[PDB]
Amino acid sequence: MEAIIISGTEMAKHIQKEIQRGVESWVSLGNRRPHLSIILVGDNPASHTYVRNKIRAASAVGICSELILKPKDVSQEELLDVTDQLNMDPRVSGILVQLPLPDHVDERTICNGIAPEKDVDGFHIINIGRLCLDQHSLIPATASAVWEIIKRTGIQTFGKNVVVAGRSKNVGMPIAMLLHTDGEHERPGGDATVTIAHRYTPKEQLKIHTQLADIIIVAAGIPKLITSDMVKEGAAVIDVGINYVKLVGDVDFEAVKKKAGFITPVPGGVGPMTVAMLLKNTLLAAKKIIY
Ligand SMILES: Nc1nc(N)c(NC(=O)Nc2ccc(C(=O)N[C@@H](CCC(=O)O)C(=O)O)cc2)c(=O)[nH]1
Ligand SMILES: Nc1ncnc2c1ncn2[C@@H]1O[C@H](COP(=O)(O)OP(=O)(O)O)[C@@H](O)[C@H]1OP(=O)(O)O
């Protein structure tokens, strides 16, 4: 069947309008306009592209931003000095450290250096802890994005088989967490039956599991990891992969769009929604209502 191709770009646009209305409403009440401080380390052109999209989108919804550049050979200590300063600046509502960081910087240490209340990526251990206990939290943007695409398309999760191909602590694990957890908890989940796959799932076992799946979510960085033979007729296929090989996903799109009932393209799928959900988090953080 010809898959319905989900426009992340368009959905992100609708959602940015909602956040824009949200920001004006917050400022209409006597409150400070959200300010997002972004730290970009080094010269990765993809990292530079994503931060520009984030600043441009922030501007569009009336969220102030400032870009703090650091060179690739910056120290862990120097990064934590900046995060400390930003934590103490009451005009900064949100702090984002673009990943990945240089190999000599411990990611987990920097993530934990951001005040939870300002942690718009939700990578701080307290925010991860609260996510894993289904409490109100700043929910990681890409994970939020996937959940939002699913809900606004009307893809049913409740009682459904879902495979998450990816266990990363920033993307994979949060997706598994949102999708499988109780619909009635403080932070509702999808009530889906979730299989977690990763680099040590034999491909033959991954296929056996995807074949039974009502939803495949792949966040692997392996072009054509998901081939049409792996997909159940009518299934939803959410492609979080970004592969510069030409930009392609983890899904064999031209084949899988003939088998699936719903597919996200790359580019134009999860990417723009990552940006949108970060801005939602930036507004939410500014209102200081979780902590
Ligand atoms: N701290 C932190 N680091 C991170 N690395 C991420 N992820 C993180 O920025 N992802 C991301 C991926 C793609 C796009 C994007 O704009 N994608 C478009 C355009 C792609 C392109 O021009 O190359 C698309 O898929 O259509 C934006 C953000 C994050 O959310 N927080
Ligand atoms: N063949 C495969 N099948 C399913 N998932 C795979 C996969 N190969 C990689 N992945 C997963 O896709 C994800 C890639 O995410 P990532 O690049 O952000 O990695 P990291 O967690 O090290 O930062 C990983 O969770 C990865 O599994 P590992 O934790 O074992 O590295």
Coordinates of C-alpha atoms and ligand atoms in Angstrom, one line a residue:
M1 CA 0.0 0.0 0.0
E2 CA 1.3 3.6 -0.6
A3 CA 2.3 4.9 2.9
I4 CA 0.9 8.2 4.2
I5 CA 4.2 10.3 4.3
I6 CA 4.2 12.3 7.6
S7 CA 5.5 15.9 7.0
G8 CA 7.5 16.6 10.2
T9 CA 8.3 20.1 8.6
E10 CA 4.5 21.0 8.5
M11 CA 3.7 19.5 11.9
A12 CA 6.6 21.4 13.5
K13 CA 5.2 24.6 11.9
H14 CA 1.7 24.0 13.4
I15 CA 3.4 23.3 16.8
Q16 CA 5.7 26.4 16.7
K17 CA 2.5 28.5 16.1
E18 CA 1.0 27.0 19.4
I19 CA 4.3 27.8 21.2
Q20 CA 4.4 31.4 19.8
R21 CA 0.8 31.9 21.2
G22 CA 2.0 30.2 24.4
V23 CA 5.0 32.7 24.7
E24 CA 2.8 35.8 24.1
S25 CA 0.3 34.5 26.7
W26 CA 3.2 34.0 29.3
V27 CA 4.6 37.6 28.5
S28 CA 0.9 39.0 28.5
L29 CA 1.0 38.0 32.2
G30 CA 3.9 40.1 33.6
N31 CA 6.5 37.3 33.1
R32 CA 10.0 37.5 31.5
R33 CA 10.3 36.4 27.8
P34 CA 12.0 33.0 27.7
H35 CA 15.8 33.2 27.0
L36 CA 17.7 30.1 25.6
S37 CA 21.5 30.0 26.0
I38 CA 23.2 27.5 23.6
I39 CA 26.8 26.2 23.8
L40 CA 28.2 25.0 20.5
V41 CA 31.7 23.3 20.8
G42 CA 33.8 22.8 17.7
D43 CA 33.1 22.9 13.9
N44 CA 30.8 19.9 13.1
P45 CA 28.8 21.2 10.1
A46 CA 25.7 19.1 11.1
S47 CA 25.9 20.5 14.7
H48 CA 26.2 24.0 13.3
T49 CA 23.1 23.4 11.0
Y50 CA 20.9 22.0 13.8
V51 CA 21.8 25.0 16.2
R52 CA 21.0 27.6 13.4
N53 CA 17.6 25.8 12.8
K54 CA 17.1 26.0 16.6
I55 CA 18.0 29.8 16.9
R56 CA 15.9 30.6 13.7
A57 CA 12.8 28.7 15.1
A58 CA 13.3 30.3 18.6
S59 CA 13.4 33.8 17.0
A60 CA 10.1 32.8 15.0
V61 CA 8.2 31.9 18.2
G62 CA 9.5 35.0 20.1
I63 CA 12.1 33.2 22.3
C64 CA 15.4 35.1 22.8
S65 CA 18.6 33.1 22.3
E66 CA 22.3 33.6 22.6
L67 CA 25.0 31.4 21.0
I68 CA 28.2 30.7 23.0
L69 CA 30.9 29.2 20.8
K70 CA 33.8 27.2 22.3
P71 CA 36.6 25.6 20.3
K72 CA 36.9 21.7 19.9
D73 CA 40.0 21.6 22.3
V74 CA 38.0 23.2 25.2
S75 CA 38.3 21.5 28.7
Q76 CA 35.5 19.9 30.6
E77 CA 36.2 22.4 33.5
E78 CA 35.8 25.4 31.1
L79 CA 32.4 24.1 29.9
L80 CA 31.2 23.6 33.6
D81 CA 32.4 27.2 34.3
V82 CA 30.0 28.4 31.6
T83 CA 27.1 26.2 32.7
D84 CA 27.6 27.4 36.4
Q85 CA 27.4 31.1 35.2
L86 CA 24.2 30.4 33.2
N87 CA 22.7 28.5 36.1
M88 CA 23.1 31.7 38.2
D89 CA 21.8 34.1 35.5
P90 CA 18.1 34.6 36.4
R91 CA 17.4 36.0 32.8
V92 CA 18.4 32.6 31.3
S93 CA 15.4 30.2 31.4
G94 CA 17.0 27.3 29.3
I95 CA 20.5 26.0 28.7
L96 CA 21.4 23.6 25.8
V97 CA 24.8 22.0 25.2
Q98 CA 24.8 20.7 21.6
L99 CA 26.1 17.1 21.4
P100 CA 28.2 15.4 20.6
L101 CA 31.1 16.9 22.6
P102 CA 34.9 16.3 22.2
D103 CA 36.2 12.8 23.4
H104 CA 38.1 14.5 26.3
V105 CA 34.8 15.9 27.7
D106 CA 32.5 13.6 29.8
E107 CA 29.0 14.2 28.3
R108 CA 27.2 12.9 31.5
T109 CA 29.3 15.4 33.7
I110 CA 28.3 18.4 31.5
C111 CA 24.5 17.3 31.3
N112 CA 24.6 17.1 35.1
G113 CA 26.1 20.7 35.2
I114 CA 22.9 22.2 33.9
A115 CA 20.3 23.2 36.5
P116 CA 17.4 20.7 36.1
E117 CA 14.9 23.6 36.0
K118 CA 16.9 25.1 32.9
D119 CA 17.7 21.6 31.4
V120 CA 15.6 22.0 28.1
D121 CA 17.1 18.8 26.6
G122 CA 16.1 16.8 29.8
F123 CA 19.5 15.0 29.9
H124 CA 20.2 15.9 33.5
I125 CA 20.1 12.7 35.7
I126 CA 17.2 14.1 37.8
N127 CA 15.2 14.8 34.6
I128 CA 16.1 11.2 33.3
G129 CA 15.2 9.8 36.8
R130 CA 11.8 11.6 36.7
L131 CA 11.1 10.4 33.1
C132 CA 11.8 6.8 34.1
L133 CA 9.3 7.1 37.1
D134 CA 6.6 8.7 34.8
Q135 CA 6.7 12.0 36.7
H136 CA 6.4 15.6 35.2
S137 CA 9.9 16.4 33.7
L138 CA 11.6 18.2 30.8
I139 CA 11.2 15.3 28.2
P140 CA 14.1 14.9 25.7
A141 CA 13.1 16.7 22.4
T142 CA 13.7 13.9 19.8
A143 CA 11.9 11.4 22.1
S144 CA 9.0 14.0 22.6
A145 CA 9.0 14.5 18.8
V146 CA 8.5 10.8 18.0
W147 CA 5.7 10.5 20.6
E148 CA 4.1 13.7 19.2
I149 CA 4.3 12.5 15.5
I150 CA 2.6 9.2 16.7
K151 CA -0.2 10.9 18.7
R152 CA -1.1 13.7 16.1
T153 CA -1.1 11.1 13.2
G154 CA -3.6 9.0 15.4
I155 CA -1.2 6.0 15.4
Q156 CA -2.6 3.8 18.3
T157 CA 0.1 2.7 20.9
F158 CA -2.3 1.2 23.5
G159 CA -1.9 -2.6 23.5
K160 CA 0.2 -2.4 20.3
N161 CA 3.5 -4.0 19.4
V162 CA 6.3 -1.4 19.2
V163 CA 10.0 -2.1 18.3
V164 CA 12.5 0.6 19.3
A165 CA 15.8 -0.1 17.3
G166 CA 18.2 2.0 19.6
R167 CA 18.9 2.1 23.3
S168 CA 20.9 5.4 23.5
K169 CA 20.4 7.2 26.9
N170 CA 19.5 10.5 25.0
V171 CA 17.0 9.1 22.4
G172 CA 16.4 5.3 22.4
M173 CA 15.8 4.7 26.1
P174 CA 13.5 7.8 26.5
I175 CA 11.4 6.6 23.4
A176 CA 11.1 3.1 25.0
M177 CA 10.1 4.8 28.3
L178 CA 7.4 7.1 26.8
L179 CA 5.9 4.3 24.6
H180 CA 5.5 1.5 27.1
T181 CA 4.4 3.3 30.3
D182 CA 1.0 3.8 32.0
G183 CA -1.5 6.1 30.2
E184 CA -2.8 7.2 33.7
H185 CA 0.5 8.2 35.4
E186 CA 1.5 11.9 36.2
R187 CA 3.3 11.9 32.8
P188 CA 1.1 9.6 30.7
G189 CA 2.8 6.8 28.5
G190 CA 1.7 4.9 25.4
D191 CA 0.8 1.6 27.1
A192 CA 2.5 -0.2 24.1
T193 CA 4.3 -3.6 24.2
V194 CA 7.9 -2.4 23.6
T195 CA 10.8 -4.5 22.3
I196 CA 14.3 -2.7 22.7
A197 CA 16.9 -3.7 20.0
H198 CA 20.5 -2.5 19.8
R199 CA 23.8 -3.3 18.1
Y200 CA 23.9 -6.8 19.7
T201 CA 20.4 -7.8 18.5
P202 CA 21.2 -10.3 15.7
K203 CA 19.6 -8.8 12.5
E204 CA 17.6 -12.1 12.1
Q205 CA 16.0 -11.5 15.6
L206 CA 15.4 -7.7 14.8
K207 CA 13.4 -8.8 11.7
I208 CA 11.4 -11.5 13.6
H209 CA 10.4 -8.7 16.0
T210 CA 9.7 -5.8 13.5
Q211 CA 7.5 -8.3 11.5
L212 CA 5.0 -8.4 14.5
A213 CA 5.4 -4.6 15.1
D214 CA 2.5 -2.1 14.7
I215 CA 5.2 0.7 15.0
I216 CA 8.9 0.6 14.2
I217 CA 11.0 3.4 15.7
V218 CA 14.7 3.2 14.5
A219 CA 17.4 5.5 16.0
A220 CA 20.6 3.5 14.9
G221 CA 22.5 5.6 12.3
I222 CA 22.6 2.6 9.9
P223 CA 21.2 3.4 6.4
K224 CA 18.7 0.8 5.2
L225 CA 18.7 -1.0 8.6
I226 CA 14.9 -1.3 8.1
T227 CA 14.0 -3.0 4.8
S228 CA 10.4 -3.7 3.5
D229 CA 10.7 -7.5 4.3
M230 CA 11.0 -6.5 8.0
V231 CA 7.8 -4.4 8.0
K232 CA 4.2 -5.6 8.8
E233 CA 1.7 -4.4 6.1
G234 CA 0.1 -1.1 7.3
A235 CA 2.7 -0.6 10.1
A236 CA 3.9 2.9 11.2
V237 CA 7.7 3.5 10.6
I238 CA 9.3 6.4 12.4
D239 CA 12.9 7.2 11.2
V240 CA 15.1 9.0 13.7
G241 CA 18.2 8.2 11.6
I242 CA 20.4 11.0 10.1
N243 CA 23.0 9.5 7.7
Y244 CA 25.3 11.8 5.5
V245 CA 26.6 9.1 3.0
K246 CA 23.3 12.9 0.4
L247 CA 21.1 12.7 3.6
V248 CA 19.2 9.4 4.2
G249 CA 17.5 7.7 7.2
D250 CA 17.8 4.2 8.8
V251 CA 14.8 3.1 6.7
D252 CA 14.8 1.9 3.0
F253 CA 12.2 4.6 2.3
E254 CA 11.6 3.9 -1.5
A255 CA 10.7 0.2 -0.6
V256 CA 9.2 0.6 2.9
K257 CA 6.7 3.3 1.6
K258 CA 5.1 0.5 -0.5
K259 CA 4.6 -1.8 2.6
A260 CA 4.0 0.6 5.6
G261 CA 0.7 2.5 6.4
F262 CA 2.7 5.5 7.7
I263 CA 6.4 6.7 7.3
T264 CA 8.5 9.7 8.2
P265 CA 10.9 10.8 5.5
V266 CA 14.5 12.0 6.1
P267 CA 15.0 14.9 5.8
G268 CA 11.6 16.6 6.7
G269 CA 10.4 14.0 9.4
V270 CA 11.6 13.8 13.0
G271 CA 14.3 16.5 12.5
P272 CA 12.0 19.6 12.4
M273 CA 9.9 18.1 15.3
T274 CA 13.1 17.8 17.5
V275 CA 13.5 21.6 17.1
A276 CA 9.7 22.2 17.9
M277 CA 9.7 20.1 21.1
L278 CA 12.9 21.9 22.3
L279 CA 11.0 25.2 22.1
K280 CA 8.0 23.7 23.9
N281 CA 10.6 22.6 26.6
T282 CA 12.1 26.2 26.6
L283 CA 8.6 27.7 27.3
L284 CA 7.8 25.0 29.9
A285 CA 11.2 25.5 31.7
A286 CA 10.6 29.4 31.8
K287 CA 7.3 28.8 33.8
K288 CA 9.3 27.0 36.5
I289 CA 6.4 24.6 37.3
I290 CA 8.2 21.1 37.5
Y291 CA 10.5 22.0 40.5
Ligands
LIG1 N1 22.1 19.0 23.3 C1 21.5 18.4 22.2 N2 22.3 17.8 21.2 C2 21.8 17.2 20.1 N3 22.7 16.7 19.1 C3 20.5 17.1 19.9 N4 19.9 16.6 18.8 C4 19.6 17.3 17.6 O1 19.9 18.6 17.6 N5 19.0 16.8 16.5 C5 18.6 17.4 15.3 C6 18.6 16.6 14.1 C7 18.1 17.2 13.0 C8 17.6 18.5 12.9 C9 17.1 19.1 11.6 O2 16.9 20.4 11.6 N6 16.8 18.3 10.6 C10 16.2 18.7 9.3 C11 17.3 19.3 8.4 C12 18.5 18.4 8.2 C13 19.7 19.0 7.5 O3 19.7 20.1 6.9 O4 20.8 18.4 7.4 C14 15.5 17.5 8.8 O5 15.7 16.3 9.2 O6 14.6 17.7 7.9 C15 17.6 19.2 14.1 C16 18.1 18.7 15.3 C17 19.6 17.6 20.8 O7 18.4 17.6 20.7 N7 20.1 18.3 22.1
LIG2 N1 22.2 -3.2 14.2 C1 21.4 -2.4 15.2 N2 20.2 -2.8 15.5 C2 19.5 -2.1 16.4 N3 20.0 -1.0 17.0 C3 21.3 -0.6 16.7 C4 22.0 -1.3 15.8 N4 23.2 -0.7 15.8 C5 23.2 0.3 16.6 N5 22.0 0.4 17.2 C6 21.6 1.3 18.2 O1 21.3 2.7 17.8 C7 21.7 3.5 18.7 C8 22.7 4.5 18.1 O2 22.6 5.7 19.0 P1 23.9 6.6 19.3 O3 24.8 6.7 18.0 O4 23.5 7.9 19.8 O5 24.9 5.8 20.3 P2 25.5 6.2 21.8 O6 24.6 5.7 22.8 O7 26.8 5.5 22.0 O8 25.8 7.7 21.9 C9 22.5 2.6 19.9 O9 21.7 2.5 21.0 C10 22.9 1.5 19.2 O10 23.1 0.3 20.1 P3 24.4 0.3 21.2 O11 24.0 0.9 22.5 O12 24.6 -1.1 21.3 O13 25.5 1.0 20.6

